[PDB]
Ligand binder design. Structure first.
Ligand SMILES: O=C(O)c1cccc(C(=O)O)n1
Ligand SMILES: O=C(O)c1cccc(C(=O)O)n1
Ligand SMILES: O=C(O)c1cccc(C(=O)O)n1
Ligand SMILES: [Eu+2]
Length: 207
């Protein structure tokens, strides 16, 4: 499957793509404002994620740090990134269909649209100014809006036992972005797409 990753933000982002225990494609790349990077994701990839990283420094070996979404200091991510990270999440070719969503469960850093480029399903978007509106107690200095689990490490925010409800913090993410997961047991906003669909992830879709 191809994912066209487009940075419409006015600032550079460092895109990242991983399934947690491995890179997808090269795993990461710099996208200046307006740039597009098309990656190949193997069919059957389960639990893949794409995200943006902001304010990164990398040396000539591809090692450094990002203020948001750092993946163990690598340009080419092999693992998931440090919250806060808005997540484009996908599982492909799962019994004939693909499944996509956006999630704020690991916080929010950059607004994103995640849509199919092929027929048969809708896209999802979280484009609101979550960083600007972020509750004070969730604000990340280096940028972004942390999820409550990251900040407070309670069973209720982290849904540790598989039993948890919505919270004042989850409801903030949900209010700003109804079509993204706001906590672990949120009413799902996963979209079913035809198996082997192709996609576009756009950062800053409205600006
Ligand atoms: O490599 C990492 O990110 C790491 C390693 C050990 C513990 C933790 C953790 O508890 O977050 N994270
Ligand atoms: O298991 C973990 O602790 C973990 C996994 C992916 C990324 C990170 C991180 O960036 O801290 N930590
Ligand atoms: O030091 C770390 O590895 C760390 C710190 C904050 C969050 C996380 C995480 O979400 O894994 N990991
Ligand atoms: Eu960690």
């Amino acid at each position: 499957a191809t994912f066209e990753i487009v940075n419409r933000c006015s600032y550079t982002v460092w895109a990242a793509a991983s399934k947690g225990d491995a890179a997808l494609d090269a795993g990461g790349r710099q996208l200046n404002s307006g740039e597009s990077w098309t990656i190949n994701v193997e069919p059957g990839t389960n639990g893949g994620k794409i995200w943006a990283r902001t304010d990164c420094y990398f040396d000539d070996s591809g090692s450094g740090i990002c203020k948001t979404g750092d993946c163990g200091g690598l340009l080419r991510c092999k693992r998931f990134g440090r919250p806060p990270t808005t997540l484009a999440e996908f599982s492909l070719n799962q019994y004939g269909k693909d499944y996509i969503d956006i999630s704020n469960i690991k916080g929010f850093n950059v607004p994103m649209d995640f849509s199919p480029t092929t027929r048969g399903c809708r896209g999802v978007r979280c484009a609101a100014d979550i960083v600007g509106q972020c509750p004070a107690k969730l604000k990340a200095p280096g940028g972004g809006c942390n999820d409550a689990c990251t900040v407070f490490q309670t069973s209720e925010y982290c849904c540790t036992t598989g039993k948890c409800g919505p919270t004042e913090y989850s409801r903030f993410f949900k209010r700003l972005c109804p079509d993204a997961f706001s906590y672990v047991l949120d009413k799902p906003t996963t979209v079913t797409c035809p198996g082997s669909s192709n996609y576009r992830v756009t950062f800053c879709p409205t600006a």
